[PDB]
Amino acid sequence: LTYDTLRFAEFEDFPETSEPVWILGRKYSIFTEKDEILSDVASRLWFTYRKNFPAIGGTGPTSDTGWGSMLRCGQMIFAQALVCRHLGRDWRWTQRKRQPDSYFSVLNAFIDRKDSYYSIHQIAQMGVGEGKSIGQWYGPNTVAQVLKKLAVFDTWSSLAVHIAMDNTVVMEEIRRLCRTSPWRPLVLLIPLRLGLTDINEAYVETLKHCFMMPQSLGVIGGKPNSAHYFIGYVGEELIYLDPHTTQPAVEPIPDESFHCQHPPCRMSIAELDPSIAVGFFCKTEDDFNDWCQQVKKLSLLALPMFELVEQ
Amino acid sequence: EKTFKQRRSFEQRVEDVRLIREQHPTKIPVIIERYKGEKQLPVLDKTKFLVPDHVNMSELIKIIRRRLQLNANQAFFLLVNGHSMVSVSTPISEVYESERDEDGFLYMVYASQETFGTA
Predict the structure, then answer these.
(1) Using CA atoms, how far apart are residues A284 and A160, in angstroms rounded to an integer?
(2) What span, in angstroms and rounded, lies between the C-alpha atoms of A247 and A50?
(3) Would you give the DSSP letter of residue B85?
(4) Residues A276, A27: contact at Cβ < 8 Å?
(5) Rounded to an integer, what distance in angstroms lies between the CA atom of residue A200 and that of residue B101?
(6) Domain of B4?
(7) In A48-139, where does DSSP find H-type helix?
(8) What is the residue range of the signal peptide feature (chain B)?
(9) Which domain holds residue A286?
């Protein structure tokens, strides 16, 4: 029998425009690289709401629907950092195809169970020490701060997590952190407030470039009442992975539910809420030095969202 | 409750500035209030500040963080005319020269970040 395989059925969503598509530091053409685009997007670890998982704290929720949106986005950006740290940015996922052990090690760290390094359980409970009740909605900085504390227990990754406050990135503090225990892989998270009710148009160009760097981990934030993990953009639209879908907790690891095998959702940049957190991953010091060099070159046309200072 | 601009008329505010600058020629009169939409950060006792013109944004941000009793870990942003101030060596005197209001005061609002969740 001869079959029609319906190639590109998944793109029945995406627009036509020839404007390039940027995904975490990678550029693609909608015309000739659809397969590459879908492969890159589907390979990212996708975390949605889950239900019927062990009660958080013994007597807490068995589901995070409705309140875990920003926690899930935090998981996705941190997982991308882990993916880059243990598998590399060139790694790609394929269904039913054997994946490296490090892959299952990364995925396991995010499974919905108390024993996992970055599970909803660990995040919600660590969040209490940050003044966040279990079940209370999170902002970008809060989840980034909780992740930093949880990464301390993860010796397998041995990451250096720097959260730059006050729109300032102090190179000297980062070097001392990454050289302290020679260079621990760096996860740089920068919480920002790009305006009062909307994002100032002057920041739009700078934000686009934040997705165009090799070290780009993307951005977490969302539309009013909807957290998203932004992985890039196309034209005047941001592309993202959405956690607003409740799926059964994985009860064995069958990983199909952790990959979004469709072109990413889109939203106008102008609809972006001003409260965000931009992330960058610098494997080695040379990668960091390269990042600084790039940030410095952004003194183009486009007001900076953050400033790079030495001391 | 009313903001500073609502409690004192424009002509009245212009006079407040004339007097204060007369008595303190090396100070910058600054109005710092919590953003109307901000809900997590506390409200300050005072909203009128007289800042030595050499004080930079890094120092201003830190002392205001202290006034609010915040930990370095908590999200805080000081916005002038809609944009956040970076923790840098820029003197308040330069910000005043380029961002001050027509009434003579330099206005700022502070905020943290919104939280997210779904229905």
Answers:
(1) 11
(2) 5
(3) P
(4) no
(5) 19
(6) 1-119
(7) 69-86, 101-108, 120-128
(8) none
(9) 1-311
CATH of the domain at B27: 3.10.20.90
Are the beta carbons of A93 and A259 closer than 8 angstroms? yes
Which residues, 6 or more positions from A182, have their beta carbon under 8 angstroms from its beta carbon? none
Contact B71/A at CB under 8 A: no
Distance separating alpha carbons of residues A203 and A100, to the nearest angstrom? 39
Backbone angles phi, psi at A271, to 5 degrees: -90, -5
Experimental method: X-ray
Q: What gap in Å lies between CA B1 and CA B5, rounded to an integer?
A: 12
Q: Given an 8 Å threshold on Cβ–Cβ distance, is A167 in contact with B77?
A: yes
Nearest to A151 by CA among A187, A180, A176, A127: A187
Which residue, A7, A120, A22, A135, is CA-closest to A71?
A: A120
Distance CA A191, CA A178 (A): 20
Q: Is A299 exposed, middle or buried (0-12, 13-18, 19+ CB in 10 A)?
A: exposed
Residue type, B31: I
Quick check: helix, strand or coil at residue A199? coil
- Number of domains chain B contains: 1
Best mutation target among A67, A72, A130, A193 (most B Cβ atoms within 10 Å) is A193
By C-alpha distance, the chain B residue nearest A144 is: B73
* Count of Cβ atoms closer than 10 Å to residue A155 Cβ: 9
Select from B87, B115, B119 the Cβ nearest to the Cβ of A168. Answer: B87
* Tokens linked to A221: 């934030």
**Number of domains making up chain A:** 1
